[PDB]
Structure 1
Amino acid sequence: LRQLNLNNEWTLDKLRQRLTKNAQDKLELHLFMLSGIPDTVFDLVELEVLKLELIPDVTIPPSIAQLTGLKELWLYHTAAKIEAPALAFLRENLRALHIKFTDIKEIPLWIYSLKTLEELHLTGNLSAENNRYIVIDGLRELKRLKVLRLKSNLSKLPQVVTDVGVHLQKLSINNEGTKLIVLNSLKKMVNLTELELIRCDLERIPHSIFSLHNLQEIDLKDNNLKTIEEIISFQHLHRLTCLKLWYNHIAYIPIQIGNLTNLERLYLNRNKIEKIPTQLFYCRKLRYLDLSHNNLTFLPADIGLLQNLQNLAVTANRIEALPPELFQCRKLRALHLGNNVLQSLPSRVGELTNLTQIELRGNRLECLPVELGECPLLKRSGLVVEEDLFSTLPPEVKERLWRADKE
């Protein structure tokens, strides 16, 4: 009766109100704390992302076949039991699938029978007792799976994952405070294009990566390296396009990474950098950099060799002026100089019209120039300049900046 009441209670009109848009401009429905699943939810064909969160006693009716745009279904803490015609429909229609659970209790069985899906995101503790990678032994039949994010506090790499990966393309590893035992088993699996390692507390980058020549995006965030004698061994790999080593504790970055001109992204913010020598910056074509919250006394000169920048950061450190070497660069769009001690502002940095988003709030500048008055490109919603001296700025400068907040 409650399920029948839910259908009449949730009208299509009320549901259309609940539809929002996600990052991909796709229509998402957030079903939050519903005792059942309304058939009116499957009535509305405009849905794309079906977020059903902590919904118990789920029996997904095949009226979902009438829903047209469904490529995402977000199963959070749900014991799902789908019907066979719905199985047939989602085998040809669904394209991504996120699953959150508490061990075997909320892991569903119909997920394996769907063999055409691309994205299979698994959330919840899979490191359960007495079930050491034996539940996921039924993943072998999946040959179309290319994106597989594994965030389940895994202890070891499953051998079944090694068997299945032959047709994989994207893989992400999140351990949230657990030392993974990789044991160099990645030599088998060659097709992999994107690999990520977040907060593994390793300090020792494995060797099986170098046998793979297809990795373009490598994310090693919060790995806390201190002496990277690995970027002399990363010279073996000639596919990595953007290294992501941010929120580490790098004491000094070893110079050899200067030889990879294909590097385009230097994420190194919130670090313990004391001095970083020059030859790091022999690569010219780096766009995004982040160096916030450091102890650097001067930004090294051969960053001046970098001519293809888009973002930097001098946040919360002991740098008082922008060197002429940084003025040899011509592509400073974004920066992060807020809550800092920058004193002198020359005309070279100020004439950079394409300044996209520079943090400057809390900076210890002396006075702000009248060069923030006229042009319709560099303005407040772009550049958040220090508001203590924005008051002493002329009202026409404030006109440009408030124009940013309007235009």
Structure 2
Amino acid sequence: AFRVLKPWWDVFTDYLSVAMLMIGVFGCTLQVMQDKIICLPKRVEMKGLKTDLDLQQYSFINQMCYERALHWYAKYFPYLVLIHTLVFMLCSNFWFKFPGSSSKIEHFISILGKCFDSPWTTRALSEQAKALFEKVKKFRLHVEEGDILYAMYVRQTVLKVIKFLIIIAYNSALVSKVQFTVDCNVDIQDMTGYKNFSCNHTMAHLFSKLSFCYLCFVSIYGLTCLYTLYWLFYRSLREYSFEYVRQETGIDDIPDVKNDFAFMLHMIDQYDPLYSKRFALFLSEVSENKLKQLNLNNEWTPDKLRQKLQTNAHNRLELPLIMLSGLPDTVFEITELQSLKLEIIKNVMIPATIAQLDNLQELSLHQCSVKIHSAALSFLKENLKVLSVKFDDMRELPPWMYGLRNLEELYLVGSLSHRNVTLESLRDLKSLKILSIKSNVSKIPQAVVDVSSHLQKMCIHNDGTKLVMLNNLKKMTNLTELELVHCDLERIPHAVFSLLSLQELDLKENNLKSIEEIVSFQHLRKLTVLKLWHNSITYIPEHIKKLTSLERLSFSHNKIEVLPSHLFLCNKIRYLDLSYNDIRFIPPEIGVLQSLQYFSITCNKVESLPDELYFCKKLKTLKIGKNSLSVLSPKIGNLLFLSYLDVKGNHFEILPPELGDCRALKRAGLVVEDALFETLPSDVREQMKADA
């Protein structure tokens, strides 16, 4: 901030100014020492020329004639040179004495010094520099808006030039004016009796010679200004192009700088090019990317990663990654985890280092625009078996995943149709077995036809975008598991029966009130599972009783109030859930479904419990829900296998000790009011809460 700021010509001018200051102080010192004029009255074997005057009269004449005849330049030359030298020095150093410019220049000097002081600069050219990067960009944004410093420096140069010109111009004339002798014709006569006087003062001749050499100095000074002025109109210093660091280091960033930034770069280059070389990289963005990589690698230890390792949803060892700028290399040192999820980590590319991570089959990507390596791609196609993608606008969507073959589980989160899904061909997915979609697609894409030959499980849950077109749905014959959530069809589309190998069915949130297409379900006697979530059924078909293979039945959230007992002809069912309906009564013939093991009718107005319900002793989970049931029958002892019971919200007053016979049911599986449990005697409550 005090030494590196000066180009060579500036140093030359500074030393010249010092020399001028020395000249001026020397002249002033000599003047105050011996500036004496001697005077005699002019008009008048040779002999004396006695003037019969006292000394004091001579002193008076000296003073008066000194004031009168001797030119003022001769008298004041030392002060003049001293002040003009001082004006040079002040005009030179106002470049830093001005606080507005001073702050900018000082902050630049500090940042550049810390920049070339960084050994990380050398390492990149071959840590804490990261903090210096933000200061670099802060300075570049804050100060590039300036260039006033350049203009006012130009002003300083111009004023130095013009002041040099004026000094030379007028001194060239005044130098001749001084003289050794002098002749003053002053009317002190008749008070001293003399009118004409010859005089001379000591310094005159010396000053002449002195001033002579002084002029030379000034000339030299002016020359330097010209050079600088040439340098000021020969470089167009409002812009600098590196064009060699970008050439040599090959980094195509660091294109250019602003005007004052070009100014400071050229100045420091005049001082030394190497500082410009060192200062250039901190502006490179790739350098900061590599530094971020280094910092995360230092911070992310394999121990730290193993701290965050947990189990995924699908029983695998997985590493959470919620916010990163890239891939820590230490991650590749942990190959044992079978799953991996990365969330909101943009602009990433997986190297061949994934080849280390062989013991992996599951990968997850929540809004991460990530690409691959070729060896990484081969490793994926040969090793990855499960993939989850939460994309938003297909910006995260990579094409190369369509080349994957060994994948068998796939989950899609992110709207596609937004109204035809812009889905690429699902050809290479040769080992695919599970497909999941969470989008707003209106028609089944063609690309699914590309994989259905071996697919087994699929999952579509649109946000209400009704699947208007069903052609490819009729092709999904090899498909074996199907569930529809909020597909908004309101009925059973004919394509449903197009698939025979299906065993599990759902029409969740599809508002089903009359589902009497059961006739073509008599074409599908393999339907083991039938879900009807969030539907509209107050009207149960009879034809369902013709189906034999039914094992688990769902009719959650519907509006039927009386269930026709002939529906009990599907005697193979085990899991039954008519919850959130308007049912009120239970027919006795409900005893004929001995295979039933699960029962749940929550949020319904069921009122009667026929002991025949106890007859299906396989029932282990009975969930009446909030109801109006008042009596607990003894035949609950018939349910020695009852593992769960949900009676919350009923009219049981005192619970008989019958629950003592129910070993399989304990305090956990019991859902009743605590007052109800209070009426239970000691033995039942003891065998229930503990082993007694």
Of 193-202 and 310-319, more deviation after overlay is shown by 310-319
Give the distance between the partners of 1:22 and 1:385, measured in 2 at CA: 34
1:231 maps to: 518
Give the distance between the partners of 1:217 and 1:116, measured in 2 at CA: 25
Give the distance between the partners of 1:224 and 1:303, measured in 2 at CA: 27
1:340 maps to: 627
Which residues in structure 2 correspond to 1:6-405 (within 5 Å)? 6-128=296-418, 132-134=420-422, 136-373=423-660, 376-403=663-690
The alpha carbon displacement at 1:288 in A equals: 0.9
The alpha carbon displacement at 1:265 in A equals: 0.5
Of 20-29 and 44-53, more deviation after overlay is shown by 20-29
Aligned CA distance change for structure 1 residues 43 and 323 (closer, same or farther; 3 Å): same
Give the distance between the partners of 2:339 and 2:346, measured in 1 at CA: 19
**Equivalent AA in structure 1 for residue 567 of structure 2:** L
Aligned CA distance change for structure 1 residues 228 and 188 (closer, same or farther; 3 Å): closer
Aligned CA distance change for structure 1 residues 185 and 56 (closer, same or farther; 3 Å): closer
The alpha carbon displacement at 1:367 in A equals: 0.9
Give the distance between the partners of 2:509 and 2:614, measured in 1 at CA: 31
Of 46-55 and 61-70, more deviation after overlay is shown by 61-70
State the Cα deviation string for residues 379-403 of structure 1 (Å, max 9, x = none).
Answer: 1112223322112323443333332
Length-normalised TM-score, structure 2: 0.55
The alpha carbon displacement at 1:194 in A equals: 1.3
SS at match of 1:195: coil
The alpha carbon displacement at 1:173 in A equals: 1.5
The alpha carbon displacement at 1:184 in A equals: 3.6
8 Å contact kept, 2:448–2:472:
no
8 Å contact kept, 1:27–1:48:
yes
Give the distance between the partners of 1:369 and 1:37, measured in 2 at CA: 64
SS at match of 2:492: coil
Which structure has the bigger radius of gyration? Answer: 2
Of 40-49 and 88-97, more deviation after overlay is shown by 40-49
**Equivalent AA in structure 1 for residue 510 of structure 2:** N
The alpha carbon displacement at 1:373 in A equals: 4.1
8 Å contact kept, 1:269–1:294:
yes
SS at match of 1:249: coil
SS at match of 2:495: coil
Of 176-185 and 89-98, more deviation after overlay is shown by 176-185
2:186 maps to: none
8 Å contact kept, 2:421–2:443:
no
State the Cα deviation string for residues 1-59 of structure 1 (Å, max 9, x = none).
Answer: 12221122122222222121234432122211223222222321221121111111221
Of 246-255 and 33-42, more deviation after overlay is shown by 33-42
The alpha carbon displacement at 1:224 in A equals: 1.9
Aligned CA distance change for structure 1 residues 169 and 283 (closer, same or farther; 3 Å): same
The alpha carbon displacement at 1:374 in A equals: 7.0
SS at match of 1:149: strand
Give the distance between the partners of 1:276 and 1:376, measured in 2 at CA: 32
8 Å contact kept, 2:402–2:424:
no
The alpha carbon displacement at 1:222 in A equals: 2.2
8 Å contact kept, 1:65–1:86:
yes
State the Cα deviation string for residues 164-192 of structure 1 (Å, max 9, x = none).
Answer: 42332222221122211124443334211
SS at match of 1:121: strand
2:218 maps to: none
The alpha carbon displacement at 1:128 in A equals: 4.0
Length-normalised TM-score, structure 1: 0.92
Q: What is the aligned length?
A: 402
Give the distance between the partners of 1:252 and 1:334, measured in 2 at CA: 26
Give the distance between the partners of 1:268 and 1:375, measured in 2 at CA: 29
Aligned CA distance change for structure 1 residues 251 and 338 (closer, same or farther; 3 Å): closer
The alpha carbon displacement at 1:337 in A equals: 2.1
The alpha carbon displacement at 1:198 in A equals: 1.1
Aligned CA distance change for structure 1 residues 16 and 141 (closer, same or farther; 3 Å): closer
**Equivalent AA in structure 1 for residue 403 of structure 2:** S
Of 98-107 and 382-391, more deviation after overlay is shown by 382-391
Aligned CA distance change for structure 1 residues 33 and 388 (closer, same or farther; 3 Å): farther
Give the distance between the partners of 1:327 and 1:138, measured in 2 at CA: 54
State the Cα deviation string for residues 99-127 of structure 1 (Å, max 9, x = none).
Answer: 11122211112212222211222111112
Give the distance between the partners of 1:59 and 1:222, measured in 2 at CA: 40
Give the distance between the partners of 1:255 and 1:58, measured in 2 at CA: 58
Give the distance between the partners of 2:588 and 2:609, measured in 1 at CA: 11
8 Å contact kept, 1:179–1:201:
yes
The alpha carbon displacement at 1:250 in A equals: 0.9
8 Å contact kept, 1:361–1:387:
no
Gaps of 5+ in 1: none
Give the distance between the partners of 1:183 and 1:261, measured in 2 at CA: 27
Give the distance between the partners of 1:21 and 1:292, measured in 2 at CA: 33
Gaps of 5+ in 2: 1-290
SS at match of 2:494: coil
Instruction: Choose between structure 1 and 2: higher helix proportion.
Output: 2
Give the distance between the partners of 1:239 and 1:289, measured in 2 at CA: 18
Of 44-53 and 29-38, more deviation after overlay is shown by 29-38
